[PDB]
Amino acid sequence: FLNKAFEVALKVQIIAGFDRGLVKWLRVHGRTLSTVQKKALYFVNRRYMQTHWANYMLWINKKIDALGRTPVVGDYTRLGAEIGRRIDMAYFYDFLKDKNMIPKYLPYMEEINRMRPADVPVKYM
Amino acid sequence: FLNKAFEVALKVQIIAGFDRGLVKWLRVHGRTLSTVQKKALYFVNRRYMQTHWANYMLWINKKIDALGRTPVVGDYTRLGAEIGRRIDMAYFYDFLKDKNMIPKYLPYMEEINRMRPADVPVKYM
């Protein structure tokens, strides 16, 4: 169960960070990509944080524990931003383009894309 | 644009071969996976063929011409069988498995999974 202002800061940072990378990769790989192909690669960012939240959570915690002081939302932004910067997604984007298995844009991918990133639903462990 | 007699024979064989690679992958990467994941993955087989069918069409227009005579459907069944074995989907299944990006099971995907092989929609180019 986790406190909203922490959870949200984690989110806003991580997916924003995954999207800068896609914005950098697309400047040079996107010449041939339809809009719904470019928007399928933004869904992949959002879903990536979903399938990896619990793994990121063990690491957030042991660090938040290591602060000695109470956590303020400020250090949830910093850890969140440090995952956004530290993950290699172009690898993923390359395998999907290279095997032309960039997913087919289904209605529910746009359900996840129309949402404001602080709201993308995750689960736990 | 290909008499459906032949196109049906390529599909049944392509997808069949792709599935014998997946049941044999599942036979060592299973208990660990929910049912919907084993079925997102069957969609991946179908979809891969819909997204690489132009590359099958170039290779089959070529080795059909080389026949020296009119094809009948059995020439199809053999080249469809073949396109179905000289792939190793295992690496594709494993990057979705390690990078925990097996696709989320969505509506459209079980409509394609419901369809007899012989009817999986491929558009001609």
Burial (Cβ within 10 Å: 0-12, 13-18, ≥19) of residue B46: buried
Tokens 């227009």 correspond to: B61
Q: Does A28 touch chain B (CB under 8 A)?
A: no
Inspect the interface and report whether the beta carbons of B52 and A95 lie closer than 8 Å: no
CA of A51: which chain B residue's CA is closest?
B100
Experimental technique used to determine this entry: X-ray
Of B51, B50, B39, nearest to B103 by C-alpha is B39
CA of B51: which chain A residue's CA is closest?
A100
Q: Does B55 touch chain A (CB under 8 A)?
A: no
Domains of chain B: total: 1
CATH code of the domain covering residue A36: 1.20.150.10
| Domain interval for residue A31 | 1-125
Within 10 angstroms of residue A110's Cβ, the number of other Cβ atoms is 15
Going from the C-alpha of B123 to that of each of A2, B44, B100, B116, B119, the distances in angstroms are 47, 17, 30, 16, 12
Measure the CA–CA gap between A65 and A63, rounded to whole angstroms: 5
Query: Is the CA virtual torsion A73, A74, A78, A79 positive or negative?
Result: negative
Residue B30 tokens read as 């299973």
Report resolution (Å) to 1 decimal. 2.8
Burial (Cβ within 10 Å: 0-12, 13-18, ≥19) of residue B38: middle
Inspect the interface and report whether the beta carbons of A108 and B103 lie closer than 8 Å: no
Within 10 angstroms of residue A10's Cβ, the number of other Cβ atoms is 26
Closest Cα in chain B, distance from residue A89 (Å): 10
CB-side neighbour CA atoms (13 Å) of B29: 18
Per the CB < 8 A criterion, the answer to whether A76 and A26 are in contact is no
Within 10 angstroms of residue A115's Cβ, the number of other Cβ atoms is 12
